[PDB]
Design a protein around this ligand. Structure first.
Ligand SMILES: Nc1ncnc2c1ncn2[C@@H]1O[C@H](CSCC[C@H](N)C(=O)O)[C@@H](O)[C@H]1O
Ligand SMILES: Nc1ncnc2c1ncn2[C@@H]1O[C@H](CSCC[C@H](N)C(=O)O)[C@@H](O)[C@H]1O
Lengths: 122, 375, 227, 375, 227, 122
RNA sequence: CCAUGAGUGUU
RNA sequence: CCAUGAGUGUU
RNA sequence: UUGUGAUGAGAACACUCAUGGUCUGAAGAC
RNA sequence: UCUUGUGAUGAGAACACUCAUGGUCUGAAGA
C-alpha cells in the first residue's frame, strides 16, 4: 500500500499492539485519525500507529509528513480492526498514538529502536 | 566504513575519524549546482557523489539525508544514514578551508562570492515554483469575491439611505439590492415611474401598483437632477459590481474544479475556496483534523472560549453550507461535525492523489443529514 | 547630533537635534535603506537608525543585554529572516568577513528578503523549512551565533535541532520566546520557564533572560552557550 | 383676567376658576387646522383666537405659549403667559367631551377619528419639511465618498496581492494605486509592457526602464488570459471608482459652498461635510463648544480617556486638516485647539445668518498657526 | 400551544409546541405585523408575540413588574416612540377606547412609526421634541399613564416637565433609566439612585424599581405615582 | 442686536454684574462662551449671562436656544468688558454662568424673578 | 480574538 | 469605544 | 499673544497581508 | 437490533456590515 513507508514484520507489528494495550491501562493513549493528528501537532505523541488496510488510503496519508515535521516515530500494523480492538474499541480504528507509555516504556523503546533500524538509522 | 558528505562544494568521502578518504569537486557552475540541489531534495544523489562512490569501493557508507538512502541502495551499496553526525559537523567546521583544499575555488574571496550568487539563484528558483501553484489563484479570487460582496452591501446600504431623501417609501417596498439599484439607476426621479417601464423590468402588477401609488403619495423631498445623478453614480456601480461578482463566481468554479474537485463536490466552489483561503493552501487544509475544519473562520468565538473555558463555536465559515444555516439550531452542531468530517477526507484525497470520490462522499454525507433531521 | 561607539562592536548611538537617543549601525551599503529607517551622515560616515520597537535584537540591548555574541566577522545562522529588518542590522555588524545565513519559509516574504540579500553579499537567503535543517545542510557551514526568531509552537525544539547540526560547541544561541505563538491559553511567565528548562536539559547554559516588554508584548529573549 | 386656550378643537376663553367665558370652534378641515398649527409654532395666533378676542374684550389675557405674547401685544392687548397653568390642565382634563360641547364633533367616534387623521397630516407635513434641508444632501455624499475611499483602498490592496502572483516586483515599483491599476488594466500580461505604451501613460524614463527590466527578469508565474481577466476586472473597477470619487467631490464642493460656506472656507468641502456628517446637521454643529469639535471623530480614544482618567485625544476628524497631520506632534495640540475654535465660530455664522466672514476667519487662523510654528 | 390571561389586562402567555413561554398581546390589526413578530392563532384569536429583548415594557413584566398602570382604555403619553415596536403593543392593550399619543423627534424613524399609526386609529404620532411639550400641547389631552423611554442625559427632568403638563394627578409614570446615556463614566447603580431622587423631590412616589438585565444592559425602569 | 431676546434695564444689568462677583468668591462660576456652553449642556448653570455687544454676533447666538432646551434662565449686560472684568479677568468675556450662587443666592433669585417679568411670565 | 513582522487609505 | 432601537450581507 | 480660548493631552479614524496560537472524544436513537 | 474513532455526544459563541438616539477633553496663562 502507498502511504506505507517501510515494511513491518508481524512480530514487530504485534510487539506494537501489546505496547498499545499496556498503554491503555497504565498510561495514556489517543485513538482515531483526528485525535491522532491533534496529538502529533501538539507534540504529545511518543508513537503513532497507522493501520495498513485503510480505505480511502488518503485518510491517513498525512500522518507520515506530520510525524516527520515533529520528529515523532510512526509504525504500521496490518488490521484497522486489530488496532481498533487493541485500543479497547469494538470498531476499527485507522490510526492511533501512545502519549504516555506508563508500564510499556521498555516495550515502546524497543519498538522505536527496531523501526529506526529498518528505516536505516545509525 | 565511510561517512559521505554532499555539499555545494562537491562530494567528499570520510573515514570515521574525520580525514578525507577521497573527494570529487563539483563543477563551479550555477546552473548545474542548482539542479543537483533541487534533485537532492527528492533524494537523488549528486552526480559528483555517484562518481566518488566508484573511486572508493566502500562496504559501509552512511549519508546525512534519509531520502538518499534508498536511491544508493538501488545503486549497489549497503547504506544507512546518521543525522547531525560528528563527521558532518567536522566537515562544516573546516568549511571555510576545505573549499580551497579540494580546489573548488581559489580563495575565501570567491568561495563566498560564488556561494552568495548560488543562494540567490537557488531561492529565486524555489520562489518561482511556489508562485506557480494553481490554488493561489483560487484563493485570491474568492478573497476578491468576498470583498465585492462586502462592497455591494456597503453601497446598497448607503444608496437606500441617500435615495430615501427623495423617495423614502421605496426602501421597504424593494427588498432586493440589485432591484433597488436598477430602479434608481434607470428612473432616478420618482415621477418617471411608469407601469410599463416597470413592467419591462419584470415587476408584477400588484407590486407595480404598490410602487406607483407610493411614489405619487410620497412624502419625500423634491431634488435637482444634479443631486440625483450623484446618487445614480453609486446606483450604477452597485449594478456593475453585481456583474463583476457573477463573473468571478464563474471563474472560481472553474479553477476550483481543477484544484479541489472533491471539496467542491461537498461544499461548492466558493465555500471550498474560502476554506483554502483560511487554511492557506490545499496542502495545509489536507493536514488538518476535522475538529479544526469545523471551526475555521470562527476564531473570535473559539479563542474567547479557550481562554475562558467557555462554550466553543459549533461552526466557522462552514456555517455557510445551506444545510447548516437553514436548519434549526439543535441540528447544526451535528450537521457541522459531519460536514467537517467529510471535508477532512475530501481535502486529503485532492491533496494526495486527485482521485475522485466526491460523489460518494457527498452521498454518505446526505445520509447522515437525513438521520439527524429525523429526530 | 553626535554618533558614538558603544560597549558592543559596530553599534553606535545618536545624540539628536532634540535630545532623543537611538541605536544605529554602520551602514554596509551607503545610500540605501531596507525598511523605512532614517539614513544619517556624521563625519562623512553613513549610519542606519536601528528601531528598538521593530527589531527584537535592538530591543534586548536597550533592555540591558549583557553580552552581544554578534560582532565583527561573526558567522551566524538566522531562523526566521522575514522581510529582513533585523538580519540587515546583523549584516551591518558582522561586515563582509562575517556571514549571515537567513532561513525563512514564507515565499510571500522571502520575496522581499531577496531584495535585501542582493544588496548585501553578507546575507545568504534560504527559502527552507527550519524544521528540516537537512534541506540547507548542503549549503551552509557551522556558525558561531545561532539567532532564532520563528513563530512556531515548537520553536525551542526547532532551535535545538538546528544547533546540534550547525552550532559550534561553546557557541551562543539567541532564542526569542513567543509566548502567544506557543499557547494563548497559558500565562507568558510559565511559558518562559518551561522553555528555558527545555534548553537547560539539552545542555544549553542560560547566560541571560530579557523581557522585551514594551518593545514586543509577551516576548522574551534568551542568551545561552551550547555545550 | 382671561385665560386663553388654543387647540385642534378651536379657541376657548376661560376665567380663573375654569369656566368657559366664550368659545369659537375651529372649522372641521384638516388642511386649515394643519396650517394654523404650523404657524402657531412661530407664535402666530389662530385666526380663531383673533375672532374670540374681539367678542370678549378682556383687560388682561394670559396664553400658554410664550412665543404668542408679542404677537398679541402688537394686536393691542395686555398679555402674559403661564406654563402648565391649572386652567390649561383643567381644559385638557375635559377634552374627550368639550369637543362635543362647543360642537366641533358630534361624538367621540369622530373627534378621535378626526384628531387621528389630523396627526397623520400634521406630522406627514413636518416630515416633508425635514427632507428638504440642503445639508442632508451634503451629509450623504461625503459618507458615500468615504465608502469609496475605503473601497478603493480595499480593492487596490487585493489587486496588488493578486497581480503579484504574475508580477511581484511591480508592487514596490508603483506606489500609486490609480497607477498600479492602470498598468494592470491596459497591459495585463507583463510581456506586453513596452517603452512606448508606458511612455504614452506619462511614466518618466528612469522609471520606464526600471519596470521593463523588472518585468524581464521577473520571478512570477505564467498565467492564462482567463486568470488575467479576473484580475483586470478588479483593476478596471478601481479606475471606475476613482472617476466616481472625483465626480462626487465636485458635487460635494458645490452643495457645501451653498449650505456652509464659512466652514468650507476654513477646512474645504469634504472635511466640512464630514464634520456635518458626525454632528448630524449644521445646526447640531453650530450648538457645539470648540472642545467638542476638536475631538469629533475620535470617540474611541476619547471615551477610553474619560473612562480611565487617561489622556484625551488631541484631534478627531480635524486631524485631516493638512496643517495638523503635516506638522510635528508638539505643535498639533495647539493648531487643533485653534482650528476647533475658529470652526465653532464659522458654523454659528453659517447656521444663524449666512453672512460671509470665512476670509477673516481663515486669515486669523493662519496667523495663530504661524505664531505656533515659530517655536 | 395554549394562550392564557395573566395578572395584567390584555397581556397573555403562550405555551408552545416545544415548551417555550412568551408574552403576547391581542392583535388589534389581524394578519399584520409591525416588526418581525410571530402571528399566532388560538381559539380563533390572533396574538402578536411580544419580544422582551426588544421591548422594555415586556422586559419589565418578566423581571417582575407588580402592577401595570397601562390597561384597557388607558390614555397614555409615550415619550420616544421610535420605530413603533413597544407602542404597537400598548396599542393592542389599550384598545381603541384607549389612546396612545406618540412623541418622537427623529424623522428617519418617525418615517416608519407613521406606517404603524395608519393601521391603528389607536396611535397619534407626533414628530416633536419632548423637551418642548408646548409644541404638542395643542393636540393632545391629559392622560392616565406617562411612559418615558428617551435617550437624553436630562431624561428624568424631561419626564417631569411633561408630567406637570399632561399627567393626571394620582396618575402613573413609567420611566426608563438609560444609565449609559446619562453618563458612561458613572456607575449605573449610582445613576439609578440619584435619578429616583429627582423623582422624589418632584413629589413622585416611587412604587417599584426594576432592573432590566439581561433583556437590556445598564437600564432600570421606574413605576411611580404623580401627586 | 439680534440674539438679544428682551430688554434689560441697566439697574438689573448692574444687579447681575454684582451677583456674578459675589459668586466668584463664595460660590462657583464659569467664564467664556465655550465653558458657558458646556455648563448649559451639562445642566450645571443656574444663570447664563450674555453680553449684548459681541462681535461677530453669531458667537453667542446659540445660547438662547441652548438655554431654552435645558430651561436655564438667561440675562444680558451691556459690556463684555464689564462682564469680563466683573468675572475676575482683565479681558472681556462674551458670556458666563453661575453654577453655585453662594452668597448671591438671594441676589440671583430676584434676578430670575425680574427677568421673568419683562419676559412676561405669570 | 491575541501576539509578532511588513504595509495601505482619508493625506 | 459604550448603551439602546431598526436593519443588511455571505444566504 | 490670550475666555472671540493660554496651558496641558506620551490616544485621529479606517484598512491589508504574512507567521503562529485552531473545540470535545464514545456514546446516541427505538 | 441499527448508526458509530473513516467520529457518537455536547457546544446557551459563524463571520462581515448599516443607520437612528444619547454619553463628546482641559480652563489661564504663554515667549
Ligand atoms: N518553520 C519555519 N521555518 C522557517 N521560518 C519560519 C518557520 N516558522 C515561522 N517562520 C518565520 O518566522 C517569522 C516570524 S517574525 C520574525 C522576524 C525577524 N526575525 C525580525 O526580527 O525581523 C515569519 O516570517 C515566519 O515565516
Ligand atoms: N428630545 C427628544 N424628543 C423626542 N424623542 C426623543 C428625544 N430625545 C431622544 N428621543 C428618542 O428616544 C428614542 C430612544 S429609542 C426608544 C425605543 C422605543 N421607545 C421602543 O421601545 O420601541 C430615540 O428614537 C430618540 O429619537
Amino acid at each position: 500500500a502507498s502511504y506505507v513507508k517501510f515494511e513491518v514484520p508481524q512480530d514487530l507489528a504485534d510487539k506494537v499492539l501489546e505496547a498499545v494495550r499496556k498503554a491503555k491501562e497504565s498510561g495514556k493513549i489517543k485513538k482515531g485519525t483526528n485525535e491522532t493528528t491533534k496529538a502529533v501537532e501538539r507534540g504529545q505523541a511518543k508513537l503513532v500507529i497507522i493501520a495498513e488496510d485503510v480505505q480511502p488510503e488518503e485518510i491517513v496519508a498525512h500522518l507520515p509528513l506530520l510525524c516527520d515535521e515533529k520528529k515523532i516515530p510512526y509504525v504500521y500494523v496490518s488490521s484497522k480492526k486489530a488496532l481498533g480492538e487493541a485500543c479497547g474499541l469494538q470498531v476499527a480504528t485507522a490510526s492511533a498514538a501512545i502519549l504516555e507509555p506508563g508500564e510499556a516504556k521498555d516495550l515502546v523503546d524497543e519498538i522505536i529502536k527496531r523501526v529506526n533500524e529498518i528505516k536505516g538509522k545509525t | 566504513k565511510i561517512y559521505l558528505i554532499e555539499h555545494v562544494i562537491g562530494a567528499v568521502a570520510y573515514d570515521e575519524n574525520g580525514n578525507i578518504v577521497d573527494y570529487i569537486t563539483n563543477p563551479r557552475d550555477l546552473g548545474k549546482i542548482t539542479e543537483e540541489l533541487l534533485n537532492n531534495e527528492k533524494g537523488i544523489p549528486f552526480s559528483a557523489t555517484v562518481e566518488l562512490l566508484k573511486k572508493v569501493n566502500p562496504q559501509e557508507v552512511v549519508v546525512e539525508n534519509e531520502a538518499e538512502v534508498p536511491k544508493l541502495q538501488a545503486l549497489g551499496y549497503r547504506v544507512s544514514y546518521e543525522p547531525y553526525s560528528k563527521v558532518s559537523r567536522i566537515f562544516r567546521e573546516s568549511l571555510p578551508k576545505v573549499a580551497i583544499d579540494i580546489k573548488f575555488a581559489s580563495n575565501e574571496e570567491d568561495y563566498y562570492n560564488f556561494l552568495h550568487e548560488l543562494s540567490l539563484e537557488y531561492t529565486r528558483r524555489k520562489l518561482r515554483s511556489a508562485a506557480q501553484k494553481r490554488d493561489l489563484l483560487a484563493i485570491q479570487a474568492v478573497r476578491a469575491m468576498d470583498d465585492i460582496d462586502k462592497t455591494i452591501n456597503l453601497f446598497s446600504e448607503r444608496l437606500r439611505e441617500w435615495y430615501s431623501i427623495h423617495f423614502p417609501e421605496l426602501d421597504k417596498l424593494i427588498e432586493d439590492h440589485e432591484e433597488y439599484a436598477t430602479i434608481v439607476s434607470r428612473f432616478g426621479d420618482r415621477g418617471f415611474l411608469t407601469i410599463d417601464s416597470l413592467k419591462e423590468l419584470g415587476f408584477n402588477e400588484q407590486r407595480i401598483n404598490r410602487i406607483l401609488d407610493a411614489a405619487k403619495k410620497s412624502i419625500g423631498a423634491d431634488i435637482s437632477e444634479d443631486d440625483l445623478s450623484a446618487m445614480r453614480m453609486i446606483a450604477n456601480t452597485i449594478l456593475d459590481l453585481y456583474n463583476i461578482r457573477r463573473n468571478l463566481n464563474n471563474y472560481l468554479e472553474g479553477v476550483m474544479k481543477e484544484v479541489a474537485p472533491n471539496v467542491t463536490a461537498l461544499v461548492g466552489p466558493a465555500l471550498g475556496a474560502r476554506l483554502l483561503s483560511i487554511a492557506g493552501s490545499l496542502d495545509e487544509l489536507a493536514k488538518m483534523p476535522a475538529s479544526t475544519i469545523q471551526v475555521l473562520g470562527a476564531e473570535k468565538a473559539l479563542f474567547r472560549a479557550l481562554r475562558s473555558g467557555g462554550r466553543p463555536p459549533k461552526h466557522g465559515i462552514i456555517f455557510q453550507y445551506p444545510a447548516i444555516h437553514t436548519s434549526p439550531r439543535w441540528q447544526r452542531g451535528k450537521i457541522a461535525r459531519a460536514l467537517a468530517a467529510k471535508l477532512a477526507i475530501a481535502a486529503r484525497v485532492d491533496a494526495f492523489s486527485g482521485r475522485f470520490i466526491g460523489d460518494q462522499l457527498n452521498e454518505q454525507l446526505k445520509k447522515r443529514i437525513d438521520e439527524i433531521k429525523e429526530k | 547630533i553626535t554618533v558614538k561607539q558603544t560597549n558592543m562592536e559596530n553599534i553606535y548611538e545618536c545624540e539628536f537635534n532634540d535630545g532623543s537617543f537611538r541605536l544605529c549601525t554602520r551602514n554596509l551599503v551607503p545610500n540605501f535603506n531596507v525598511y523605512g529607517e532614517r539614513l544619517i551622515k556624521y563625519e562623512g560616515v553613513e549610519y542606519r537608525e536601528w528601531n528598538a520597537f521593530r527589531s527584537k535584537l535592538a530591543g534586548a540591548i536597550l533592555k540591558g543585554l549583557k553580552t552581544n555574541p554578534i560582532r565583527k566577522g561573526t558567522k551566524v545562522l538566522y531562523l526566521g529572516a522575514a522581510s529582513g529588518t533585523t538580519i540587515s542590522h546583523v549584516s551591518d555588524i558582522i561586515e563582509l568577513n562575517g556571514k549571515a545565513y537567513g532561513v525563512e519559509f514564507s515565499p510571500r516574504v522571502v520575496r522581499e528578503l531577496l531584495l535585501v540579500a542582493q544588496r548585501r553579499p553578507n546575507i545568504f537567503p534560504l527559502l527552507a523549512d527550519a524544521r528540516f535543517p537537512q534541506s540547507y545542510k548542503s549549503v551552509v557551514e557551522n556558525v558561531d551565533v545561532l539567532y532564532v526568531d520563528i513563530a512556531q509552537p515548537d520553536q525551542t525544539d526547532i532551535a535545538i535541532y538546528n544547533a546540534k547540526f550547525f552550532l559550534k560547541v561553546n557557541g551562543d544561541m539567541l532564542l526569542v520566546i513567543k509566548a502567544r505563538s506557543i499557547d494563548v491559553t497559558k500565562d507568558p511567565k510559565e511559558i518562559y520557564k518551561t522553555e528555558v528548562e527545555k534548553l537547560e536539559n539539552s545542555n544549553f547554559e542560560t547566560i541571560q533572560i530579557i523581557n522585551l516588554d514594551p518593545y514586543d508584548k509577551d516576548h522574551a529573549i534568551v542568551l545561552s552557550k551550547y555545550k
